[PDB]
Amino acid sequence: ATPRWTREHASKIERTDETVVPIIYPPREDAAPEINGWDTWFLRERDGSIATVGGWRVIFSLTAPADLLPGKRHDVAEIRYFYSRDGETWFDGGPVFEGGTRGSRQWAGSALLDDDGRLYVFYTASGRAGEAEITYEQRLAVGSGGSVVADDDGVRIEGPFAHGVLLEPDGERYEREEQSRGMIYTFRDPWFFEDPRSGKTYLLFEANTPIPEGAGACGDPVWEEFNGSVGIAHSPTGDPTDWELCDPLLEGICVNQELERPHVVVRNGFYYLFVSSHDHTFAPGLEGPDGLYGFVADSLRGEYRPLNGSGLVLTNPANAPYQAYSWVAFSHREELLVSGFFNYYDLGGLTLDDVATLSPDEQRAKFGGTLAPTVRVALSGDRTRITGTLSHGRIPLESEELPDLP
């Protein structure tokens, strides 16, 4: 009886003054002008707080050379880390892994600085190392055994790193590549999460749930091709490398194909599940924008219901609809901060597939590759409201006070 983001929900999706973010303009300086970054995550303690090592925060980004065309950056994505003392001025720390990485390339994940001091960097292994032609096989892997050292000049993430695959789709609860109809399947974005109530250890991820041929599970056969779901795995011992698959938390069958980068924020006893999603991954008959969608329940594996009635928590304005993507939510004392990245801007009227026609520089000029202005929202139940923004890529601690709001 897995909870469902239903079509009756998605039909109500609509931009409102409470869900549209302000226009993002390019920032004054870049931490590294020679690199593009997207899909970023924080180094967190086991409980979920932003980890601090000798006064420094650490974040991780997917990166590709700025020389490269945007459309293809996902084929050569490498994980880099950045560190900061305040939360605004980030220093480039270079690649986190010196090879031995699983997959042809790496996609987004999460990072855990355990109590023992061991560093675990969960990521997605896209493809297999040293393939002939690029494949789209996705597996949940981890780079265990890292050591983070911090003097007063910066932060070093050193080896030796040990990499292995943690999870692959079983084919019964989570669809395999062979089973994928319609668009390419998904099995990626591992996010570590310790439940602050039970204490149990979980790992969330984005998956698809298999629907048999002719199953009749939907009112139209084509709709069954859109089978995105948020899967979860459990660790009985708590070891961040020993996992067993569970039944999925939420399914968007006949609504959306990709529920990208899922994560949970627990706030005063309520579990808010957030997922980013594209507009082109919606099933036919539904119109939803690129945005952060959210659901709330009273337990981690409970009956999720969509925020704001439709599910839309946060979205870009109509006249700049691709400016940000891949949002992550995190608590700061009585606000919820949401950090995305600066994606596609200054399109005028063009669609994303239209941009592929343009000359190399006209494409590179329309891609940010930096952090978006951190958005401040206020949760009030199953209803949200955008309350403001902060500086570009501001990740503050709960120890820090944020500017006042109108």
UniProtKB/TrEMBL annotation:
Please give a single GO biological process term from the UniProt record.
carbohydrate utilization
Which domain of life does this protein belong to? Archaea
- Signal peptide region: none
**One GO MF term attached to the UniProt entry:** levansucrase activity
* Residue pairs linked by disulfide bridges in the UniProt entry: C218-C254
Q: What's this protein's family per the entry?
A: Belongs to the glycosyl hydrolase 68 family.
The name this protein goes by in its record: Levansucrase
Q: Which organism is it from?
A: Halalkalicoccus jeotgali (strain DSM 18796 / CECT 7217 / JCM 14584 / KCTC 4019 / B3)
